[model samples]
Target: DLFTCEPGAVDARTTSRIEKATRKLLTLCSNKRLKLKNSPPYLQGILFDTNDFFRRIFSLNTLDTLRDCPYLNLAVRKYLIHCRIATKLFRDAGEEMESEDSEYRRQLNKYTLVFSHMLADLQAVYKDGHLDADFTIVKIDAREFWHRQFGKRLVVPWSELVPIMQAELGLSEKEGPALQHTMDITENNHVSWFEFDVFTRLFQPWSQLINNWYVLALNHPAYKAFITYDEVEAILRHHLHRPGSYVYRLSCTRLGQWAIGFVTRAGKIVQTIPQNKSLYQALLDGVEERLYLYPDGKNVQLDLKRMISDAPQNRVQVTKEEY
Candidate 1:
């Protein structure tokens, strides 16, 4: 029975299932499986109990009544982290349970892609036999893993990153003093498995910083070109209201008009593709280019012809074939 597996030892069937899920996560980065709106029913069924197990009872800082297989525990924890990271990104992008069914499906498909990439990192660490290894080894492997996969270095030390993490999590300075106890592991420069597990537990589903790094890896050039750096600064510096939203303007030369752009509170651009969509629809969908503007009012009209004439042209060219 599923309920009666030896304490710490996963049965062959469950073990096989767990490995299958891990491999599937690694391979489905670009597969059709992830294209669906949600994880397949089979996967949902298998992971349901697993998710509940962690969310309700599993304690990162405490180890008691754990199944005998510490390695499997590591695997499950890693898998949860992968899912959490993707889920965080999805939620941060304004995709929430309250969104429409179509919008929810769209976000779900996007999350499948995000989770798939994170799983690649998890698989790499696992393959190197570091999943259940020392916390120090895991941290080293994570840095190398991210750099290898994304060409981005984890240069910010854990101390710096922790404060940012705390801010992202919205903990006050008072509450943070207590939280720092768990974060002190970073000072050691080398972490034990238990320490690493606690660290991962505290930081799973990552915050805007990690999400931003992930965005840098995705490298959506059109989206990148759509907004201005000043606008990005403006959003990050003044407009962020803890779950806030903002719209910037983009001038599409091909369409010969201005389009609206949307950014998350953390300053992430929302448009996934500007090459394939229409100006009006794209604007309606919250996409941006030339002459970035933050509309402070609703139902605003624009003089697109004049706006286009005044905007710079060097980076404004949008060719048809690029879509």
Candidate 2:
């Protein structure tokens, strides 16, 4: 029974229950039951009856057969983008995914709290990520969003930010020329904001990088405080490759939370916070198990006693709480 419905949130997933499908993408399409016959690529073969749909299938971009899948397509894209953004935020701030509900709840609350403050900017830039967002929108403007994040007017001078900005925006290098030729973004007069996140996050770690206080406080060469795992669309996974390498960050997402996002073949997006798990004890145990504080051959931990004197009295300060 085909029931008229108002709907949302879908995927290009298979209805056949296998990896691919034979035919009839919608084995059942209804409120109670919905199925996709084949995945998109293979389904194209079934419909056009051609092995090569690459050149011929351009119209398929505008047209979807069997059902009104445009809605589903958009929904899927939006959802994927949302998940990516949230994870990126979490990862940026070292909100490592936790197994326990309490930590997960905390992370969720942290995301919601941040998400609340930036809701307007996020929604405005949803489409920028190619996500089919909610029908409602706003023009937060280059000035407003820039003021909130980057702190200033929309456009920076051509000689000032352009040369660096070109390289910074991922528009430079060999792989970019084709798109850059078409867009000629680098050839522009000046750089402007309102590409929300790509621009907003550009301002994220600037202060930390410039502020001398961060380095003086941490006083460790290996520590890369206030660094983010984002460089536009790329993950910027510099440290993830070297297993046993670790670096402490002034976590971006979780306010006032300093964490060590370490590298391991055993990857975990979330780090569980067990009861009374002091960071020093964890560090001691980790070192006992053979870990390096990034840039291997630097045995900074060996002279841990110097840190007791060298490091200033700050939040990481030892109290009666630890003893």
Candidate 3:
């Protein structure tokens, strides 16, 4: 039996070390006695563990690797569970408190604030060095981590989502061969960021996507109120394309009820939103019609109806609102 052992089998001792290290970090994160200075070293130690580097960095399917490894998955799950509970406690407290400065509300805020700081510290240190990972934990941001733990879940297999995403991105059926190559981050991958964004957006809600991008698009006047300072920094760092360039941009704020303006090719802005109705609809309304142009130029319209009619539905549902 010893001679015939599976070469790929992991040693039990290896799992024990991972479990011990992860538990130590989690314990420090939730412990009231610990300060950031004390907590960060433990986190840095785990990231510095070169033995686990490949599993953390180079794995194509990171969540699977975490789950398949013994003890590590348990630690990941426990970390997420505590975060969900803290977020819930904070939200629940907000609703019951009559005044913003109430003692009970302040105490609840303290709990969540501490947890948030600990999480942020961990993320900061994780990103300080070349970890070669896009995300700090499990290829998920804190919002995504909390959402995964707390939200009502829906499961859509990658097999089903991929085709719909491909269709929406205007890729040919022959694009199937490119998927495997696209999975990696190398330049040879040939998966453009636009394609990746489209693919990922298919499994996320429209509202959530708009909210997340609100800060990125804040330069636009209509995006005044719904913006975040934190993600604005991220947007600048990422050098994102203009909001108008995104395919979903026009659809974010739906039309029909209001008038909007668009810049024309002749360097003029034209206002559009019908005074009456479209000719097609006017015919249905028993009226004669003539096409008209605005003073600056033809008023810009997205033709969203035709675009939607031509495309298949690819929507994701998200639940979770800020208190």
Candidate 4:
């Protein structure tokens, strides 16, 4: 019944039906019921489970595109991260439920494909409003897993990009404490600047923001030319929404933006491509390797609103911690 099995590639995916047919053909040939000289060779291609493909290679962070490193362009990278998360979440669900009932297994399988195909489809096009609406679906669906993993406290953490905040008003380390004091002037439970509701309530537009950056670079000669630093800065400023766009995880208590690193919603550690000498260097350090590897075994975290771009409605929140 399994699609793929092997002593080697030849035995890789021969279904029972095919095996029966081959046996029938052989008996006929031996009995002279069929012409031995006319016998045709039997061949079968290996069939692999989608799960295996994802685990080994295709899952987000690990899979690179034919043209460029997907993660290098932040939008594509974040989308893949979502894919990796969804893949593990759904697969684990199926595994747990597989013994309970066949129906449950089927549902798990369906969502698994839904998640993977969605990621692949997103990659086929240019970066744009790609993540907004889809993220809503993720947010809604992830709630199930999030609840299971985190309980009532909430698993998602709201965070802001620290560097962007500094960059936004032209502030340096010396000014942050003082500036923070000024911001502390207002302190309501939900509305104040330092309030966890306000400070942690920020979002990260990581995906669409990168998409916008890439779209600008993808379309403009200035970004494409890479002739001067000014042109690159122009591209970055044109798309990325500095202190304005942000990410909100209902579960987190961090001060500012969380780093985007390895691991999907399902918490599978993703493989990430290295960075190049471009705007990324100015924006963040060699986070590519550190981010992707996530060496401590803890999944790397990220703030989407600050990373992607679009609107309040565009945000895709993965409510499930392990999903």
Candidate 5:
């Protein structure tokens, strides 16, 4: 019996250490807790210790490498991408988690779905080449402001709104007055929960894919705002023969995404979103090959390329010939 010991057998000391570490982790994440349930693996899944439950970084599938805690939402997603382990961290205050009420439809609109795209962007950079991993965390503690503003109510006074808005952007910012003026003229001196709901809606940031070149397209005549994937070919009809003509537009399928429909002599209807290549790199490939010659004609300025790379920000060196 001693020689054939069962690993599943009780180890009181080990269990105590595991529970101690878990509480420490929970505290580290501001006491947001977790619930490990047995169910079908939705996409990617984590195994917990029930005996109690538990976690890895690489390989086809991971084993005994990870256990515990919150704030790993982004990292969990990577392993899910790598097909290793998996999502959902501890839910925090003002954060809803339940089968009925649900985590925000706000998050549903949040383009976390594009996380794979983000990873692909980085891998493309590493393969060829920091990336936009420099993503910003937005409105994290806004709930605190909301709580202080309304306390038990859903509406906030326009004066309080102005103060909070000013605090968010600083006293020197003009947005406070502008917002006050608009709210006064429209909804008057108090913002209702409905208006604040819309305010929260307005605060969501536009993703970089759309902000990058999509905005340029929006103003340009060549850009088409609504068109299906196959529909691009129809719009690209005549240009299908022309090498220079190209159009960038919103992807009908993906929210806050844009696509480039380009025509090269090599192919009639070659359009792409370049899953693995950065948009600028894709443009560079086309431009260098003389495939993407602007809508009018003539060589594009290097500054345009620089602007696209947002070095008008990032410390990343995206020079003219780097690719």
Candidate 6:
């Protein structure tokens, strides 16, 4: 009776074909590669799958139905602005700064931090599903954040380090040949001044956020160093990540490895001596050795959790403008 009553039945001869087709469809939909992401509820956490979001554009093409959707348009606009801010922070690799050192530092400090905060907020917004909050949940407009942090200070000359360089080691009083060589680049090419800082801010985020920006940032002369190895400390110095355990940045080296270094926030340098391998190699050490120092010794993991945890409390979930 059950056999004849079966609503749907397939002959054994077609079972293989059905299996193959089912497998193909599942491969297309499983997203097991975690492709661009690894977490669940993709857009509802501190990490939003932008790659997945963009992938949807192919299906949802136009914004006609979204024109009046306040939250939707604003999120789109905010992401664009964040891109612009990231671009400005990295503009040094494109246009050399031609201003004073102090001014350059001022501009650097302002934009880098703004970029960092926006990045943090951007991730938090998507992570928390708090689109209702604006200006309160997080202020995402790039120009607005820029103006609030650095108005009328757009143009900064990175070459400002010249006077400082000359003052520290007078040209007439020759020092170590190594120091002299470094000075030559500093004095000659304006690009030399901010190369390392620019590389870290540009590269590290790519490694953490998306993975390609790091390579893109390394395309410049300043980053042309390191045969391999990143100075995690130097990179984190300017990185926006809060409760950061260390200061990180790429060191200035013309040889193998644009070599990045890591140091405690208190300023203690951490590295493997002799070869002083990059963080990439350090990872291969099996995660049991000195690697324990970071998450354990520093205990910044706890601090960081606390800092980011309060992010929701400070964020505005809904905007009156939307209402």
Q: lDDT winner among the candidates?
A: 5
In model 2, state the lDDT of residue 128: 35
Every candidate's CA RMSD = 17.6, 19.1, 19.5, 23.7, 18.9, 23.6
Ranking by TM-score: 5, 1, 2, 6, 3, 4
- Give the clashing residue pairs of candidate 2, or none: 15-36, 25-37, 93-252, 93-253, 96-270, 97-269, 97-270
User: For candidate 2, what is the total of clashing residue pairs?
Assistant: 7
**Local distance difference test, candidate 5:** 0.38
The estimated TM-scores of all candidates read 0.26, 0.25, 0.20, 0.17, 0.31, 0.21
Task: State the lDDT of candidate 5 residue by residue for 116-187, as single tens digits.
Answer: 223332232222211212222223344445555665343345665666554553322333454443232212
Question: Which tens-of-lDDT digit does each residue in 1-323 have in candidate 1?
Answer: 12111244333344444545544543433334334334232333334434333333233322333345433444454454455454454445342433445565555544443333223323332333233232232334444433443233212233444554445444334433334443332222222233333343323323322322222212212233223434545554453442223343332211112333444545555433255443333433442332223443223334433333333341134233431
Task: Give the C-alpha miss distance for residue 38 in model 3, angstroms.
Answer: 44
Flag regions of model 4 displaced more than 4 Å: 1-66, 69-87, 90-161, 167-323
Q: Candidate 2, residues 1-323: lDDT per residue as tens digits?
A: 11111233222342221112212221211112212223222222222232122112222333233134332233223323433444453354332333224464345444333232222222232333332332221223423434544463333433444344344442222223232221122123233332223222322232221112222223455445344433210221544554665655433333223455555655432233223333444555666776534432243444443443343343234343332
What C-alpha root-mean-square deviation, in Å, does candidate 5 show against the real structure?
Answer: 18.9
Worst 10 residues of 6 by lDDT: 1-10
Candidate 6 global TM-score: 0.21
Question: Which candidate do you rate higher for TM-score, 4 or 5?
Answer: 5
Q: Compared with the true structure, what per-residue lDDT tens digits does model 6 show for residues 8-76?
A: 222222223333433443333233332322222121121123423432432343434333433233334
TM-score of 4: 0.17
lDDT of each: 0.36, 0.33, 0.31, 0.27, 0.38, 0.31
Q: Which scores higher on lDDT, 4 or 5?
A: 5
User: Candidate 4 lDDT, tens digit per residue, 46-113?
Assistant: 11222222222222232223123222232223323433443444356444443434554445333333
Query: Of the pair 3 and 6, which is ahead by TM-score?
Result: 6
Considering summed lDDT, which 10 consecutive residues are worst modelled in model 3? 243-252
Give the per-residue lDDT of model 3 (tens digit) for 34-105.
Answer: 232332223334323422432342243344343343222322332344445544544565444434466654
